[PDB]
Ligand binder design. Structure first.
Ligand SMILES: NC(=O)c1ccc[n+]([C@@H]2O[C@H](COP(=O)([O-])OP(=O)(O)OC[C@H]3O[C@@H](n4cnc5c(N)ncnc54)[C@H](OP(=O)(O)O)[C@@H]3O)[C@@H](O)[C@H]2O)c1
Ligand SMILES: NC(=O)c1ccc[n+]([C@@H]2O[C@H](COP(=O)([O-])OP(=O)(O)OC[C@H]3O[C@@H](n4cnc5c(N)ncnc54)[C@H](OP(=O)(O)O)[C@@H]3O)[C@@H](O)[C@H]2O)c1
Ligand SMILES: CC(C)=CCC/C(C)=C/C(=O)O
Ligand SMILES: CC(C)=CCC/C(C)=C/C(=O)O
Lengths: 366, 366
């Protein structure tokens, strides 16, 4: 059979991630802008079974290693768009920078039809980094894309600088996407809040305990926002294909606000267990501490429910929930994207439930 | 010349109001859905000069008087859509009810091509009434259209009940629109926040004083939302013409959030004066009290700047600003409208400035 024709050819760097996994789905839909798409999906681990069941050409590669990346990506002469949706899982500026440089150095000399590089960062651009030593004054919100860089060693700054330099030199377009908190389904993410809260809820249910909210008062009652992984995918694809979005920094959220108070009630209902909400006068407790000895319990759950086998620390990031539940005042604006013609949105309450439903369909959670 | 053809014929009840004045503009644009529109505009006062310069057939009528309303509206046999965007200016349930009943009793028997009645209420549906005696527990937010009625004598309840009964009996469709705080330009409104704050700012400037924020701490820092009058008009016209919107209760806001803190800075810049923002530890002061003796000052301003002559209490509602500046937790959801296909929005910061610009173009403010 003659070689298959594609209109566009994506390199998704971080294909097992919370957005990369969505891109692997969304890019292959028949009506997706820029389609038909061929998808190369890059990650460090062996292709998981769930991803092997998708029409994605998986490339196992440690992108922090330059010679390996050259060897693995330089043969991919047909790439048209790069979606960089990866990070090393620490805030180390140079390791993260090296990963992104390696992608560009390996692809740009070899992909003569390369058009665009999508760089995914996030709303930490506006408020700072997670490293405990960093005592920094964030910007006030709503966050908009005209806010200047904070005086902090945020690896996002280095990634942008590389993006601008390398696209500029090579007559490529660029986009920087700054998603809010992601609502997604990947069990291989280092920061999946829905999966994390679903695992907590599952363990509570397993142990005949209530779904006890461990967070701060402020994070219970404040306005919060998030972004569905599929909407991030759609926003990145929009910037990759639509001339109006090119060479722009762009926030990405669902377009609404919610409260954790309301999400919590929904979570309890979804698992058919009692909730204990925020109790007046109580201080936040560490969910990471509450769950520190639960690995064997999770193993037992996986076995009893015949789930996709996951290690507790890989499917859940309890430390990340702890940060979410002592955060407030982090709302980001979608006006710039809307004014440029991107009218994609989600109902965040419905998005949260859709992620639960999807994780159950995939057998990641009971 | 042969009688002019129109596709649709609007009765706008409250044509001098903050939304009615926008409808008088929007309905007459060439690309407005349902057009070409003929517009009958009803209000109690004599047609102001600014409205006489619009292609609107003005009908001076006190709609609280049944015989007068019959006499004035029963000849209008060609009405296709009613936009009820009026209230008496008190919370008296029966006077407000009487006004709306009178419209329907006068039009329904006489307009054989009548299709739809749009009823404008508002987000007070979710939190209660302004009357000082009423000590009531509001719903929590974000406000959605599935929230049940509060146990309060809100005239909105009576207006809805009349709408349902009379449309139901007569095979007409209905829509209830619940706008957030309106950003608009009418100088004849009983509740125009932008005009009110512009008048304050103008007086501050006239007296070489700073723009001193008089509100509460909470209302300075909280998330707030609003709706541009033109977007309310567009939302009402959408419900009047689009089958998907028919027989629905629908919120209407700009689709974003803002803070008064940020609006205040913008207001000061627009008037080229210094601002004093919220001062930590200060209690809210009454802007109504601050402005109680300023009528002659406003007269002098009107004369010195050659403005459209307005009485201070008619262009500004300082009591209404006082309520805005002790409110929080009033965000409403636009998901229902979006899910039904209405994707109209405004950038609220830009909307606020556009209202200032428009009021200056009309010579209502300097
Ligand atoms: N998650 C959120 O809620 C969120 C919100 C806003 C912004 N963001 C930002 O979005 C960006 C991407 O993060 P994410 O959360 O989408 O990531 P994630 O879900 O944790 O996924 C990371 C991906 O990168 C891959 N990866 C990591 N190190 C690699 C290496 N050395 N070589 C090759 N692949 C490697 C991972 O595969 P392996 O496991 O095989 O290494 C995985 O596919 C980050 O800047 C993050 O801060 C995230
Ligand atoms: N303003 C806001 O920010 C806001 C926000 C959300 C919801 N709403 C709601 O929207 C609804 C309409 O209020 P609005 O603020 O748009 O009104 P508005 O700007 O004060 O305008 C009221 C209109 O009704 C007319 N009117 C009053 N009494 C009348 C009578 N007896 N006969 C005939 N016309 C009469 C007025 O004309 P005359 O002066 O000549 O009488 C004027 O045209 C109310 O339920 C209000 O609570 C308002
Ligand atoms: C409330 C929380 C936990 C926000 C952080 C979202 C992320 C992960 C942003 C980013 O990585 O830029
Ligand atoms: C923050 C304020 C002042 C909200 C009231 C908006 C209005 C006027 C609602 C309604 O009339 O339903």
């Amino acid at each position: 059979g003659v070689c298959k024709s594609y209109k566009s050819v994506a390199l998704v760097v971080g294909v097992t991630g919370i957005v990369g996994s969505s891109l692997a789905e969304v890019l292959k839909l028949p009506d997706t802008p820029g389609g038909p798409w061929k998808v190369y999906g890059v990650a460090r681990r062996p292709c998981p079974v769930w991803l092997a069941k998708k029409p994605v050409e998986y490339i196992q590669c440690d992108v922090s290693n330059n010679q390996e990346t050259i060897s693995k990506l330089s043969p991919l002469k047909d790439i048209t768009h790069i979606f960089y949706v990866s990070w090393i899982g620490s805030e180390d500026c140079q390791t993260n920078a090296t990963m992104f440089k390696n992608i560009l150095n390996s692809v740009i000399p070899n992909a003569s039809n390369l058009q665009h590089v999508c760089l995914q960062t996030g709303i930490k651009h506006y408020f700072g980094i997670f490293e405990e030593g960093s005592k920094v004054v964030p910007h006030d919100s709503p966050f908009t894309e005209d806010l200047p860089r904070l005086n902090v060693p945020n690896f996002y700054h280095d990634l942008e600088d590389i993006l601008y330099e390398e696209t500029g030199k090579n007559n490529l377009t660029w986009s920087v996407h700054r998603p809010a908190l992601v609502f997604g389904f990947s069990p291989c993410s280092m920061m999946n809040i829905v999966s994390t809260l679903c695992v907590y809820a599952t363990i509570c249910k397993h142990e005949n305990k209530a779904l006890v909210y461990p967070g701060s008062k402020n994070s219970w009652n404040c306005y919060a926002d998030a972004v569905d992984a599929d909407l991030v995918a759609e926003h990145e694809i929009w910037a990759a294909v639509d001339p109006k979005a090119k060479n722009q920094v762009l926030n990405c959220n669902n377009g609404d606000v919610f409260k954790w108070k309301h999400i919590w009630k929904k979570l309890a209902e979804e698992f058919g267990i009692e909730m204990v909400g925020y109790v007046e006068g109580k201080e936040q407790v560490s969910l990471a501490e509450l769950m520190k000895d639960k690995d064997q319990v999770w193993d037992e759950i996986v076995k009893k429910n015949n789930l996709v086998p996951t290690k507790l620390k890989e499917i859940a990031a309890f430390w990340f929930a702890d940060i979410a539940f002592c955060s407030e005042n982090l709302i980001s604006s979608m006006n710039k994207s809307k004014e440029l013609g991107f009218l994609g949105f989600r109902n965040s309450m419905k998005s949260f439930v859709s992620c639960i439903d999807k994780m159950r369909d995939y057998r990641f959670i009971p």
